[PDB]
Amino acid sequence: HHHSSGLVPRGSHMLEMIIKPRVRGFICVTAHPTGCEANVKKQIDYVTTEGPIANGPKRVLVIGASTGYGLAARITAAFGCGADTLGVFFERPGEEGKPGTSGWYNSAAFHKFAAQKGLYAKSINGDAFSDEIKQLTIDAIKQDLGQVDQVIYSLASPRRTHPKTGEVFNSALKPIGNAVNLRGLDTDKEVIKESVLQPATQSEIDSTVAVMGGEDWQMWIDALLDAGVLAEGAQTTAFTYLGEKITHDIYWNGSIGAAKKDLDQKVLAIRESLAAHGGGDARVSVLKAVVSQASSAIPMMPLYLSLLFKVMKEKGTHEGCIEQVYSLYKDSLCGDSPHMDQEGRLRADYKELDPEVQNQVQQLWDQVTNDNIYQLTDFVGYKSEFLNLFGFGIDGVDYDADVNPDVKIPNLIQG
């Protein structure tokens, strides 16, 4: 109520908003619909430019399909191999005044671009750990695809409700046995922060294994096999990180490492199931460390990535999820000469474990306490890539323009 109220239409701005990055620590509380879309398009265009991958899968299930590596796998299979893709993930839909999560807008863009190219895209939203979500997936496959011939397992989560019992598990990102003296980077005030990380409890370890270990992976493959929706000679892979010595205390030989090690045991039994069903296979694939919501939470990773980026960038070998995964498919999942390590894993992360890269990063580490961080590291690149995840800092996007946060996805089963 003012002297001139109602004399004029309010317009669409009443339903739309200006979305700017709002970052705390390694969590960003907003996501930009238009920027997320441009992101997906960027990855699709990368794949389309590299060109088709021969001997690829045709009907693919991606578990964890909305962001990071799982998204890159979905895009590689669909736009690199022409595959049908059923995506599973867990994201918050946008509504008026309330932007959804990145994975939601990424996936909306996926369905949009896939339809444009005449590709099958359907998605299931909910708790991949649950029996309920497993059954919905099986149902979609039965109805639409008959069977899938590749299953990509790509979940990153802080917790898991056990499907059969009700117990919930929280993962811990902590060292093991010996407490670690942690260097690192306060990304807020942008200063070097020295910290002491206590090791983890036995239970803290058994939980982290429960969440990020390979039990659910095996549950998925088992579920698919007796509903009869896994094609003979199918292929499944689950993603992991090994890193080299500098990350070893916190990651490989830490709580999370313990879980990733469980992956290595479970894969043997899973591989057994598949070889019996028409000579399929199962592998753990190792990928390079990248900026993601998941990895950016790991103690040491922001500074490690900041240094890794600096060094790989000058060698000319820096890359992200889509490059990593396109080459995993081209060279390893579908190639004639696959890169197989001693434990029988597939490898895409070698450019990172390059001794020249690692030695450089290591002597830069202790040397860090700079508060002249911008000289020795690519902390700028890190920040830039972190914002990118949520659709910010993309060229060609007008961030000052109103955008509607209410974006819907067709063929999206809400579980």
Added chain:
Amino acid sequence: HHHSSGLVPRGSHMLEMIIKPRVRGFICVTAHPTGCEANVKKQIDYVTTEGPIANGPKRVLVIGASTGYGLAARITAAFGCGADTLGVFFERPGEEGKPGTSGWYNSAAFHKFAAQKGLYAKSINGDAFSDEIKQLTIDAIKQDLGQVDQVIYSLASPRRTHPKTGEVFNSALKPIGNAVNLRGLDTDKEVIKESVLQPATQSEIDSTVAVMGGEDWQMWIDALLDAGVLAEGAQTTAFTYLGEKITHDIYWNGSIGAAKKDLDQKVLAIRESLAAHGGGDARVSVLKAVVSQASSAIPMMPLYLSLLFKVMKEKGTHEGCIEQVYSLYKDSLCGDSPHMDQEGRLRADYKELDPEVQNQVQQLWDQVTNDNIYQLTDFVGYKSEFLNLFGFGIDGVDYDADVNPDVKIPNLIQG
């Protein structure tokens, strides 16, 4: 609900927003709290820099006190004369997600700055045309000030509900008798638009006089006098515009002109009342054309102002509300040698009626049809000053930062 929901505080951004100009025609649907505040501070600092005005009023009522000339008068009297000021106006308070009008944030800033300097500031929000609002004002004066010694009348409104009957009147901004061939400026697409403005009806004229004529002014002075709240030897003034020939068909000799002419008749009777009460006085004051919500609606004014600005700017005589009003007070309301025209009005607008300024503007007028508008006019300056009204384009304000639109005003009577 997402895999990481609720694990983190949302923070103040949930209650705050990013406010950007959203303009249609001559109406802007948003206002920036921080920018409006900076605006008020700018006008206060202007007055404080020019320095105190001698022989000023001490207790002042401003009717129409939140924006434009009325605001400039409130600031001049308070910060130029140390006066107590009671403001009356009609504005929309801000709330979460819904920015209030400019006048609201202007007035909040006024009360803030006035308290800082130990000055009396109280305000009344509602329909100045109503008997109800008149009575609340009288009440505040009785309680707080005893009497006021100056009354500034400064309303600009498209409509008026008659206090005694119930009739509502809409004003028309149209020519008279002979229809006008209107040149002009489409401010949206930024091109010269030629138009034909039909003249106005008799009733359209009588209504416009009802709204912008001087009946309410006289009602106010009369109301103040018999409640006994007008000091002996008081002074009242009402603002008007005359312009020169080029604006004459649309303004002076048009519908709005008719109303402003009514002012000239009513002032005689009002002056009579005041001279009897201890030798007070009443004048119509004439001010220069400025960008305001009110004036920016008048056909021809955006292009006229755009040209006026260009020309006055190069003569070095361009100025706005506070400059105009500070000098009205200094030279005319409080000075020894007041500028009085033939009809006995006070004059501040002479720099505008400068024959050199008018001749220049006139031959630039017909010459306009440029669609090279940026060369002949200061259309840029116009836009800039229009955005300024709503708190946009101010230096030192971070428009990318979240701001809380919920700003409250102490000692604000809501009528």
